[PDB]
């Protein structure tokens, strides 16, 4: 309850500058699991207008609209793009209620006088309360605007949901001593409760409309032009396709290098072979596996998972340091005899991500982590599991595996370790799309964590309902 | 930490010793604390400073 | 060891308190004629919002004299600030009856052979059931602001918490209801102004085994009280918190 | 008991001896009641005699050289002059130790009761005189505790049914007699007390039993075992599929002629009741909880742990709750419902 | 009958008479003339006198030994009043409120209470949440801890002294300081139990991560919100850290046993609370050293109880079996000795 | 715990009589050495024409307190009162005492008969007054500090006239102004500006920090705080910051709070229990 | 109750440890219970010091803990003495903080210092007698103020800005020493302290005298000085008769403001334990009067 009232007050206070009006949201077991509600850290929202422009980027177009050109030094814009995307995301005030309840009875049990048209009880196992804002640049609000929602957990994981205004405001705009605002807020209550769905129709969430909300009195105007919504739809189509065009670029690169090398594939992963195995069946299995990978590739394919850490601010400085450390001549004897010990070279082991596809039964695995090391006696690659165990799927004749390196080099592998190698071409897309769709969350300080960065994580806060409420 | 060379050097008194278990058994199980044990003639007691 | 002083009071105040172990509080009358009057802790309950209706009726029936009625009139009639008109003097140990009676109070006492402190059930509370070996006791005056009558609370509690700041840290939890109503009155009424919500005064140290329950009888109207069977006194100041 | 104690380092050759040629080797001390029982039971072997004891404490005093060594080195070597003289003389054997050189030559007679145990003579003492009318506890009145464990609601197999008592007791054929749900013990007095699942209910209902989270945490931390036998137990893959085409895509699943691996629960089912607990059962490492089953599975080509709740009692494996037990429990249900002679 | 069987385990304390033997001149007692200190006041003068006693042991091996020859009382009731799991874990609640209240009704328990802040626990060494009973003719309550067992558990395990968890964990058998071998012995299920060569007679108790492990191992209990003042008979069998610490050479293990491993339970309150300040004597506990629990006379029907009570002396030790009804005999003829002293 | 004090100056019969007539008054000495000179005895060593009354309070807080009862030959005997003991004390302020009250020590604001003068050095004793009178005097002086900056408009002068006279039981005191020649002395100005800046800085910072705390466990207290802040902003308005700037503001607010700690926490020094027409003297228990 | 406390050790003692004990006489050690007889495990701060639970938690525990002086220590008998209020005692300082005459002393968990040793003194295998710091009022209240400012600022800020902010804030110099806060962590304890601070600041913003908001600006129109230049510079980042005046209203408003300030003040103030009047010219010990 208190989050909605406080958010109304806070948006009323700042509407002079930001011109955002508040929208109160309550979410249940349909959007997030009970574990995710029990362990939620931050809730974030971002507004995108009908032109596809985020609130926090220059109106006339920005340099992020320019493409990125695959180089790790200027890694998708460096730290400045990260700072811009940090600036565009805004944080809301939220509460977690872990015990089962129904909103009608809970609000009646509170001081708020609900006045809905019919007394249909809506039950939920747990409630997370939040209020998000959507910006009208002037007194006019547009129905083609879309609002993004993000839930952030202490592990840095997050999930993205986006919905447009005309679903949020389908009917709301058509319905048009001293007193403390809390008193009249409780005595005026709420009467209309609607369900909103994400554009992909994947998340259901509820919106509450308090009659004493300050945004009522501004007599603001609302409209939804058809061409405006068509623009919103095509911009959304442009946003959603990033991973799929990246996968198609990988496909076309694979086919191009397979054509270039005349089909002769040299070994790159160490595995014993036999001259009297039928390799024609292996080639046809490679064809079928490649087709299946083209079909079942998802947003969590290895190429996107490897692109994601490249966008973090540490990448650019790390790329500079690594290139400077490689850009060295033979060391002079003076530095060897005197001074500091030599800079540590790149390690003999690496962390990789891979996609494995099976032909015997329809099955692929996408977010697979693998560790790569070079076999000294032959100079070829050896794939080890995260615990150190050897990966045997190389021997398995029904399996083809695609590997991607941290420096965006990818190996395609059929049985026997004979491989197809090429580089990922992120040239195809603007910096804005890569930087907006995927980027690691960067933590901002809150309760229960050390102010000194890099210290060991204390116990996870874990506001919970299985225990007696803590105070 | 107990000065073993002093015990080796300084004059001791004779007693009819009586350990319930075997002497080496009690030494291995360490029925006592801080046991010096060596085989043969270990010349450490000679160097006095 | 103990330090004592002799005090004079009218007979009406003594009628309920005759058993020695009662607290003695000196109230500051607004009028200059009875400028200082020595009221007992029991007299605070009849204007305390944490007492029961039965005990309140008993106290109303006990006090009859014009001095006691005037003391009640002064306690109610002032501008709701109680602790600004009160100073405590410790615990009493003498019996000297008379029309103008004499009673002696220990401002600092540890009596060597029974000296006890008498607190009523309605006024008594404890944060922790885990009785520590040594307990300090405190007097808290509570100020609600819900209505123009400004209903006050008068508490005496024993606790093992030694540091005052942590004691306030834990007291602000239950008395958080004070803070909310205080802010509510601050917004709702722009004209009248408050000072604080609660005040903490420390007087004493005693062992948990000294905390007994006992009965009191004068005017035959029975009262149930808590008895600190070997309490020693050490007067502190009135210390404010919100 | 007297033989178990070893001889002391030192010997004061004259102390604690008895008239008519007896040497005391030990003394027993116990509460007065135990001593009285020993007196009465072992009457012939006890004797009341007069023994010689030192009259005064043996005084040990420091030499000035010892004082200077204590000041300078915080240490004391008693009988320091003896060590000095024996080092200068070159004799490695001392006459006596520093402790045994005190307390002799001052014997006095006192009368006490003694017994003979083999070749030994031992004194007996009862310290009632010290602690009587005193408020301090006698250290010989110690407390020792024991731990008792007993089962309730156990099931003997029906196929191995046997009785050693039929001439002693007979029971009505009511199923409640056949399937036990109670146990009977004795109180601190010799009286019968009854324990039930109903008394246990105050423990059974608490959430900690129904929370498998710590169990799953420790089960995940250990990880899958590396033993080759465990590798066949590990390989189970569970995959969700959309239900849109499930009505007609049935032959496609069977169209490929490849085997389907077993699962941990199904492998757990196929053990005999007594064979279930033996070391040959490889599935025991997953049986951490009655109400919740555990298993290892493959997810994202990585091995992960899984915890699901056993919703109904039927999910209990055959070795933990057999079919005959279920049928007898159904008979008990019928007895409660007055349905043992069913329609 | 629910689909599981229960195993109870409880601790009973006796007040005993000990017999001790010592040899001539075992210990040399050193004494000084007393030192006197004074506190001076106007009311009275008080003198404190102090004699410093020092004991030097002149026995090479063991020169003193004890036997517990006689007993006459049980300080506990030897009852079956089940331990209150709600009191030891007052923090935990069922997620839905009404089901939690209904469970509070079903059990004889009360609303949940918050375990105090660290400062309260430092000023006050404990909570002591369970109040005293209305009356006590039977003495201190014996709280029975219940470890869940499968219904088909071999009854012969209960007829002899054994470890209630289902796997022996006596560190006198393992070689000292071999922590890997000790952990394999006490927790590994790929090798036979050292006492009975089955892998385990209770898979719900004998291996790490089990329900009884998290219930009664203090390592897991500290993770939960639990009260440390309440004594637990299972703790001596489940505290892995203490068991591993007790894995030592023979004589150091013996010293740990008779000096430092002993228990201490309060004697003033009617429920078994652990002591702190030593005003209560340390309690000897052979069950810690042997890491085994003893069987007690237990019967599923009153018929066998009648036929065993009606018989002559020594009939309590025998164990009888029926078509499913059973009785386990007491290993120690205690239930007749306690009459005998009376 | 006794201290002897010797005069460098030359005493005389009537001088000694005036010295001894304060038989059991309290004198503050800077630090407790066994032997001290007469210059250290009293507040005369601290006062000047530029400072103002506030400093004498803060310096009295850290200056050791001491009771005097004797006149020996060329030296004076002093006794340091200890906690928990009871002592005989004199009434030196313009107030009359009553049993059970608490006492505070204040710089003297009104006065001749106390003046033991030797070489233009004067034995200026502090004031012993009950705590309510001390609070009232300090509050009225601090308020009169505010009214000095305007001081021109007629109603302000009427208010200043009203503050100057304070009435207590059976007495009325003519409290002097804290400003001379229309200038406000330096510690008075410093404390007044520190208090005003504390209030002003809190007014600005409260909104940002109530928002930052609201992202934690939002509660009724923060909602009411936000409502009061909007109310304050609405009433006042009708008349992304760098971390180091924000930290500078916060540290400045906290240090400005620290400079004002001396006057807010009026410390108790004695508690009285004796009623007397002999009112000159009273017996007290010591606190400190 | 007890004027004497007897602490005894389970371990056998070496003469080196006995010498250290007899050197540590007159030092301060904390006790959790204020009891007759305690084991040596519950003596000192090694019991409570889990560095994961930061400085605020240990400060909160220590300010509730009671204090005692050291005494007639001998072989396996410590005999600590609890000081009573008002008497004159000899106390030996153990931290590097310089003590000067007239300062009031406060108890705080030890901070870091330059020689980086931390001196793992008195290690009885595992137990290690960690002893608190006794600090004069300015430095100790500086620790408290800097911790509260740390908590108030750090919320909703990225680790990069916070890195420089803590690198400047964590380091304190007092009498030309160099200390730094061991562990700044945002616990519920500091969060409740900040709740109190925010409420107090809101109240002082609300009920303050109307003229005290503008007194600074009137003085700025009146005066121009370095102090006032800085005062204006603070307020500049957000940048005649009063129509009415009533002394009673101002009196009541300033009384309320003083109540609010005293509420906010003691979030930083520490209850003084000792006041010094003596110093050894080697700063190794001082004579003090105890406050309770």
Q: What is the 3-state secondary structure (H, E, C) of chain A?
A: CHHHHHHHHHHHHHCCCCCEEEEEEEECCCCCCHHHHHCCCEEEEEEECCCCCEECECCCCCHHHCECCCCCCCHHHCHHHHHHHHHHCEECCEEEECCCEEHHHHHHHCCCCECCCCCCCCEECCEEEEEEEEECCCCEEECCCEEEEEEECCCCCEEEEEEEHHHHCCCHHHHCCCCCHHHHHHHHCEEEEEEEECCCCCCEEEEEEECCCHHHCCCCEEECCHHHHHHHHHHHHHHHCHHHHHHHHHHHHHHHHHHHCCCCCCECECCCCCCCCCHHHHHHHHHHHHHHHHHHCCCCCHHHHHHHHHCCCHHHHHHHHHHHHHCCCCCCHHHHHCCCCCCCCCCCEEEEEEEEEECCCCEEEEEEEEEEEECCCCCCEEEECCCCCECCCCCCCCEEEEEECCCCEEEEECCCCEEEEEECCHHHCEHHHHHHHCCCCCCECCCCCECCCCCCCCCCCCCCCCECCCC
Residue from C1, C112, C126, C129 to probe the interface with E (highest E Cβ count within 10 Å): C129
SS3 content of chain G, % helix, strand, coil (to 5): 40, 20, 45
State whether residue C195 sits within 8 Å of chain F by CB.
no
Chain E CA closest to residue B18: E60
Question: For residue D26, with 0-12 CB atoms within 10 Å meaning exposed, 13-18 middle and 19 or more buried, which class applies?
Answer: buried
State whether residue D31 sits within 8 Å of chain E by CB.
yes
* Those residues with Cβ within 8 angstroms of residue G99's Cβ, 6 or more apart along the chain or in another chain: G93, G105, G136, G276, G279, G283, G286
* Strand pairing report for G6-8 and G37-39: parallel
Nearest to F226 among A9, A95, A447 (CB): A9
Q: Distances in Å between the alpha carbon of D126 and those of D141, E137, G14? A: 12, 32, 39
Q: Which residues of E touch G65 (CB under 8 A)?
A: 122
| C187:F273 CB<8 A | no
Chain A CA closest to residue D238: A363
Distance of CA D282 to the CA centre of its chain: 28
Q: Residues A425, A428, A431, A432: is their CA dihedral positive or negative?
A: negative
| G205:F203 CB<8 A | yes
Nearest to G61 among E122, E125, E277 (CB): E122
Q: Are 3 or more Cβ–Cβ pairs between C and F shorter than 8 Å? A: yes
Q: Which residues of E touch G61 (CB under 8 A)?
A: 118-119, 122
State whether residue A117 sits within 8 Å of chain C by CB.
no
Nearest to C241 among G34, G252, G263 (CB): G263
Structure tokens at C212: 């007994």
Structure tokens at A206: 């509820």
Nearest to E74 among D169, D188, D215 (CB): D188
Give SS3 for G19: helix
**Residue E103 falls in which region: left (phi positive, over 0), alpha (psi -120 to 50) or beta:** alpha
State whether residue F221 sits within 8 Å of chain C by CB.
yes
d(CA E335, CA E341): 11
A335: β partners: none
d(CA D199, CA D204): 9
d(CA G73, CA A253): 82
Q: Residues A149, A151, A157, A159: is their CA dihedral positive or negative?
A: negative
Nearest to F227 among A91, A94, A180 (CB): A180
Q: What is the interface size between C and F, counted as CB pairs within 8 Å?
A: 41
Helix (H) or strand (E) holding E120: helix E118-123
Q: Which residues of A touch D239 (CB under 8 A)?
A: 363
HSE-up (13 A, CA, CB side) for residue A409: 7
| F139:G222 CB<8 A | no
Q: Which residues of E touch B30 (CB under 8 A)?
A: 249, 251-252
Phi, psi of D64 (to 5 degrees): -60, -35
d(CA D192, CA C98): 68
d(CA F288, CA D73): 48
Q: Are 3 or more Cβ–Cβ pairs between G and C shorter than 8 Å? A: yes
d(CA A455, CA C66): 71
| C188:A471 CB<8 A | no
Distance from CA of C33 to the nearest CA of E (A): 43
* CA-based nearest residue to A353, from D301, D240, D235: D301
Q: Please report the resolution in angstroms.
A: 4.0
End-to-end CA distance of chain A: 18
Q: Which residues of E touch C161 (CB under 8 A)?
A: 119-120, 123
| F243:G162 CB<8 A | yes
| G264:F249 CB<8 A | no
d(CA D160, CA F134): 96
Q: What strands lie across the sheet with D192-196, from one edge to the other?
A: D192-196, D182-186, E298-299, E326-328, E320-321
State whether residue D301 sits within 8 Å of chain A by CB.
yes
| A471:C189 CB<8 A | no
Query: What's the 3-state SS for G72-94?
Result: CCECCECCEECCCCCCEEEECCC
* Strand pairing report for A140-142 and A146-152: unpaired
Chain G CA closest to residue E279: G37
* Strand pairing report for A190-197 and A204-210: antiparallel
* Those residues with Cβ within 8 angstroms of residue E36's Cβ, 6 or more apart along the chain or in another chain: E47, E48, E49, E50
Touching subunits for chain B (3+ Cβ pairs under 8 A): D, E
d(CA F101, CA C88): 9
| G32:E119 CB<8 A | no
Chain G CA closest to residue E120: G64
Residue from B13, B17, B26, B32 to probe the interface with D (highest D Cβ count within 10 Å): B13
Distance from CA of F217 to the nearest CA of A (A): 7
Q: Which residues of F touch G162 (CB under 8 A)?
A: 243
| A446:F216 CB<8 A | yes
Quote the strand ranges of chain E, DSSP E.
5-23, 27-31, 35-40, 45-50, 53-57, 64-74, 145-149, 294-295, 298-299, 320-321, 326-328
**Are the C-beta atoms of residues A96 and A37 closer than 8 Å to each other?**
yes
Give SS3 for E58: coil
Q: Which residues of E touch B18 (CB under 8 A)?
A: 60-61
Nearest to E31 among D57, D211, D219 (CB): D57
Q: How many CB atoms lie within 10 A of CB E48?
A: 11
* CA-based nearest residue to G234, from G218, G250, G217, G258: G217
* Those residues with Cβ within 8 angstroms of residue C228's Cβ, 6 or more apart along the chain or in another chain: C116, C117, C119, C137, C158, C204, C206, C210, C211, C212
**Residue D21 falls in which region: left (phi positive, over 0), alpha (psi -120 to 50) or beta:** left
HSE-up (13 A, CA, CB side) for residue E279: 9
Nearest to F230 among A5, A13, A95 (CB): A13
The Cα angle at residue D63 between residues D60 and D64, in degrees rounded to 5: 150
SS3 content of chain C, % helix, strand, coil (to 5): 25, 40, 35
Distance from CA of A443 to the nearest CA of G (A): 7
Q: How many CB atoms lie within 10 A of CB A305?
A: 19
**Are the C-beta atoms of residues A143 and A229 closer than 8 Å to each other?**
yes
| A451:G187 CB<8 A | no
Q: Read off the DSSP letter of residue D300.
A: T
The runs of H, that is alpha helices, within D74-152 are 80-89, 128-131
Distance from CA of D284 to the nearest CA of A (A): 24
* CA-based nearest residue to A37, from A149, A202, A153: A153
């Amino acid at each position: 309850m208190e989050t909605h009232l406080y958010s109304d007050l806070a948006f009323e206070a700042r509407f002079a500058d930001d011109e955002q009006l508040p929208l109160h949201l309550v979410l249940d077991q349909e959007v997030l699991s009970n574990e995710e509600a029990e362990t939620l850290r931050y809730v974030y929202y971002r507004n995108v207008d009908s032109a596809g422009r985020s609130t926090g980027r220059a109106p006339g177009g920005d340099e992020d609209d320019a493409p990125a050109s695959d180089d790790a030094e200027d890694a998708v814009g460096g730290d400045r793009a990260f700072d811009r995307e940090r600036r565009t995301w805004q944080r809301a005030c939220f509460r977690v209620l872990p015990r089962p309840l129904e909103l009608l009875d809970y609000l009646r049990q509170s001081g708020l006088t609900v006045t809905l048209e019919k007394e249909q009880r809506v039950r939920m196992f747990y409630a997370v309360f939040t209020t998000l804002g959507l910006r009208c640049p002037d007194n006019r609000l547009s129905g083609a605007q879309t609002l993004h929602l993000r839930l952030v957990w202490p592990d840095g994981s997050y999930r993205d949901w986006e919905f447009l205004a005309r679903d949020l405001l389908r009917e709301e705009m058509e319905a048009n001593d001293e007193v403390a605002r809390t008193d009249e807020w409780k005595g005026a209550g709420v009467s209309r409760l609607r369900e909103v769905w994400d554009v992909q129709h994947r998340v259901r969430l509820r919106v509450l409309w308090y009659v004493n909300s300050f945004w009522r009195s501004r007599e603001l105007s609302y409209d939804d032009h058809e061409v405006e919504l068509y623009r919103a739809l095509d911009a959304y189509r442009a946003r959603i396709a990033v991973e799929y065009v990246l996968i198609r670029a990988v496909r076309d690169e694979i086919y191009a290098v397979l054509r270039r090398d005349g089909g002769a594939l040299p070994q790159r992963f160490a595995c014993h072979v036999s001259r009297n195995m039928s390799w024609r069946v292996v080639w046809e299995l490679c064809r079928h596996a490649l087709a299946l990978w083209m079909d079942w590739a998802d947003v969590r394919s290895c190429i996107i998972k490897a692109l994601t850490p490249r966008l973090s601010r540490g990448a650019a400085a790390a790329a500079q340091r690594a290139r400077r450390q490689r850009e060295r001549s033979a060391p002079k004897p003076q530095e060897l005899l005197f001074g500091p010990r030599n800079e540590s070279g790149p390690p003999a082991e690496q962390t990789w991500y891979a996609d494995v596809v099976r032909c015997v039964r329809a099955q692929v695995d996408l977010g697979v982590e693998v560790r790569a090391a070079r076999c000294p006696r032959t100079g070829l690659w050896i794939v080890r599991d995260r615990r150190g165990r050897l990966r045997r799927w190389l021997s398995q004749p029904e399996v083809c595996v695609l590997y991607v390196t941290p420096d965006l080099d990818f190996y395609w592998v059929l049985p026997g370790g004979f491989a197809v190698s090429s580089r990922v071409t992120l040239h195809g897309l603007a910096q804005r799309a890569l930087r907006d769709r995927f980027q690691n969350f960067e933590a901002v300080l809150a309760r229960g964590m050390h102010v000194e960065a890099g210290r060991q994580e204390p116990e996870t806060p874990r506001v919970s309902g299985r225990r007696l409420p803590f105070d | 930490m107990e000065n073993w060379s002093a015990l080796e050097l300084l004059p001791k008194v004779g007693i009819p010793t009586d350990f319930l278990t075997h002497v080496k058994t009690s030494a291995g199980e360490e029925m006592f604390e801080a046991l010096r044990i060596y085989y043969g003639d270990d010349p450490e007691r000679y160097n006095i400073h | 060891q103990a330090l004592t002083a002799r005090f004079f009071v009218p007979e009406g105040l003594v009628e309920f308190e005759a058993q020695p172990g009662a607290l003695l509080i000196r109230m500051e009358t607004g009028c200059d004629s009875p400028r200082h009057l020595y009221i007992s802790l029991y007299l605070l309950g009849i204007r305390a919002s944490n007492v029961s209706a039965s005990t309140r009726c008993l106290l109303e029936s006990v006090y009859t004299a014009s001095a006691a009625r005037a003391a009640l009139q002064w306690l109610d009639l002032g501008p709701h600030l109680l602790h600004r008109r009160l100073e405590t003097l410790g615990c009493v140990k003498t019996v000297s009856l008379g029309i103008t009676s004499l009673l002696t109070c220990v401002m600092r006492g540890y009596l060597y052979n029974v000296f006890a402190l008498m607190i009523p059930k309605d006024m008594y509370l404890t944060w922790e059931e885990t009785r520590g070996r040594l307990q300090y006791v405190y007097l808290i005056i509570v100020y609600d602001y819900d209505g123009p009558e400004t209903r006050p609370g008068i508490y005496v509690l024993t606790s093992s918490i030694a540091h005052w700041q942590t004691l306030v840290d834990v007291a602000r939890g239950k008395f958080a209801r004070e803070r909310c109503s205080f802010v509510n009155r601050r917004i709702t009424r722009p004209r009248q102004i408050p000072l604080c919500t609660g005040v903490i005064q420390k007087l004493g140290w005693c062992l948990a085994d000294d905390i007994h329950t006992s009965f009191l009888v004068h005017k035959e109207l029975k009262l149930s009280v808590v008895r600190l069977d070997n309490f020693s006194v050490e007067l502190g100041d009135f210390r404010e918190f919100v | 008991l007297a033989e178990a104690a070893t001889d002391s380092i030192l010997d004061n050759p004259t102390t604690y001896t008895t008239s008519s040629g007896a040497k005391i080797s030990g003394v027993m001390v116990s509460t007065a009641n135990v001593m009285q029982i020993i007196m009465s039971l072992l009457s012939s072997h006890i004797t009341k005699e007069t023994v010689s004891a030192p009259a005064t404490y043996g005084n040990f005093v420091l030499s000035p050289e010892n004082a200077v060594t204590a000041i300078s080195y915080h240490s004391i070597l008693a009988d320091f002059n003896s060590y000095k003289a024996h080092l200068t003389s070159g004799q490695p054997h001392l006459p006596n130790d520093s402790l045994s050189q005190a307390g002799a030559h001052s014997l006095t007679p006192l009368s006490m009761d003694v017994i003979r145990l083999g070749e030994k003579t031992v004194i007996m003492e009862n310290l009632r005189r010290v602690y009587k009318n005193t408020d301090t506890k006698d250290p010989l009145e110690r407390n020792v505790d024991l731990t008792f464990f007993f089962p309730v609601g156990l099931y003997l197999p029906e196929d191995r049914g046997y009785t050693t008592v039929e001439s002693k007791v007979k029971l009505n054929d009511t199923v409640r007699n056949a399937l036990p749900t109670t146990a009977y013990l004795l109180n601190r007095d010799r009286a019968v007390q009854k324990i039930d699942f109903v008394d246990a209910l105050k423990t059974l209902c608490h959430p900690v039993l129904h929370e498998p989270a710590p169990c799953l945490q420790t089960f995940t931390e250990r990880g899958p075992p590396s033993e080759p036998a465990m590798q066949r137990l590990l390989e189970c893959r569970f995959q969700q599929e959309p239900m849109g085409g499930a009505a007609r895509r049935i032959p496609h699943f069977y169209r490929v002629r490849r085997e389907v691996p077993r699962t941990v629960n199904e492998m757990k089912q196929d053990f005999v009741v007594t064979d279930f607990y033996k070391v040959g059962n490889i599935t025991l490492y997953t049986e951490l909880h009655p109400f919740f089953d555990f298993t290892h599975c493959q997810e994202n080509s990585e091995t992960v742990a899984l915890c699901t709740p056993r919703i109904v009692i039927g999910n209990l494996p055959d070795g933990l709750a057999p079919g005959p037990f279920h049928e007898l429990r159904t008979w008990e249900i019928m007895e409660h419902m007055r349905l043992r002679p069913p329609p | 009958h629910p689909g599981f069987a229960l195993t109870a385990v409880r601790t009973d304390t006796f007040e005993v008479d000990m017999l001790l033997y010592s040899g001539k001149s075992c210990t040399s007692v050193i004494i000084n003339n007393p030192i006197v200190t004074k506190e001076e006041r106007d009311i009275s003068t008080t003198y404190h006198v102090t004699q410093n006693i020092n004991t030097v042991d002149m026995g090479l091996g063991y020169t003193s030994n004890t036997c517990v020859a006689y007993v006459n009382r049980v300080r506990t009731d030897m009852g079956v009043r089940v331990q209150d799991l709600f009191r030891v874990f007052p923090m935990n609640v069922y997620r839905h409120d009404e089901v939690d209240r209904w469970i509070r009704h079903a059990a004889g328990v009360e609303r949940p209470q918050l375990l105090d802040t660290e400062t309260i626990s430092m000023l006050t060494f404990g909570s002591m949440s369970e109040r005293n009973a209305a009356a006590t003719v039977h003495g201190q309550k014996a709280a029975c801890e219940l470890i869940l067992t499968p219904v088909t558990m071999d009854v012969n395990y209960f007829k002899i002294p054994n470890n209630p968890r289902g796997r022996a964990s006596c560190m006198l058998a393992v070689d000292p300081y071999d922590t890997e071998a000790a952990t394999k012995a006490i927790y590994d299920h790929r090798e036979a139990d050292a006492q009975t060569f089955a892998a385990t007679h209770n898979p719900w108790a004998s291996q790490a991560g089990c329900l009884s492990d998290v219930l009664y191992n203090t390592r897991h209990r500290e993770r939960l919100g639990y009260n440390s003042k309440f004594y637990s008979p299972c703790a001596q069998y489940f505290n892995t850290e203490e068991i591993i610490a007790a894995n030592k050479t023979l004589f150091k293990t013996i010293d740990e046993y008779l000096l430092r491993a002993k228990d201490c339970i309060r004697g003033d309150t009617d429920t078994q609370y652990v002591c702190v300040e030593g005003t209560e004597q340390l309690i000897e506990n052979p069950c810690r050293l042997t890491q085994e629990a003893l069987p007690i006379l237990s019967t599923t029907t009153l018929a066998l109880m009648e036929t065993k009570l009606k018989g002559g002396a020594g009939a309590f030790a025998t164990s009888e079996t029926h078509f499913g009804n059973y009785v386990v005999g007491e290993i120690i003829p205690l239930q007749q000795s306690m009459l005998f002293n009376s | 715990a006794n201290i002897f004090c010797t005069f460098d100056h030359k005493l005389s019969i009537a001088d000694v009589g005036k010295l001894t007539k304060l038989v059991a008054a309290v004198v503050p000495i800077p630090q407790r050495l066994h032997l001290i000179k007469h210059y250290q005895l009293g507040l005369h060593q601290f006062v000047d024409h530029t400072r103002g009354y506030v400093r004498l309070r803060g310096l009295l807080r850290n200056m050791t307190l001491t009771l005097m009862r004797r006149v020996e030959g060329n030296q004076i005997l002093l006794h340091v009162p200890t906690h928990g003991l009871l002592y005989t004390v004199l009434n030196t302020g313009p107030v009359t005492w009553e049993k059970g009250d608490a006492l505070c020590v204040l710089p003297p604001l009104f006065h001749r008969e106390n003046l033991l003068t030797l070489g233009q050095w004067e034995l200026v004793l502090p004031w012993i007054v009950p705590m309510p009178l001390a609070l009232e005097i300090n509050q009225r002086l601090l308020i009169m500090g505010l009214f000095s900056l305007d001081r021109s408009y007629e109603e302000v002068k009427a208010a200043v006239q009203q503050l100057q006279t304070i009435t207590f039981r059976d007495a009325t005191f003519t409290i002097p102004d804290p400003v001379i020649d229309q200038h406000l002395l330096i510690d008075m100005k410093t404390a007044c500006l520190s208090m005003s800046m504390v209030a002003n800085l809190a007014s600005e910072l409260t909104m940002t920090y109530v928002r930052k705390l609201a992202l934690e466990d939002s509660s009724m207290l923060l909602v009411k705080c936000q409502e009061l802040l909007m109310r304050l902003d609405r009433e006042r308005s009708v008349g992304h910051v760098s971390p180091d700037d924000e930290i500078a503001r916060l540290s400045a607010l906290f240090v400005m709070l620290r400079q004002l700690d001396d006057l807010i926490r009026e410390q108790v020094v004695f508690t009285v229990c004796d009623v007397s027409p002999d009112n000159k003297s009273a017996t007290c228990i010591f606190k400190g």
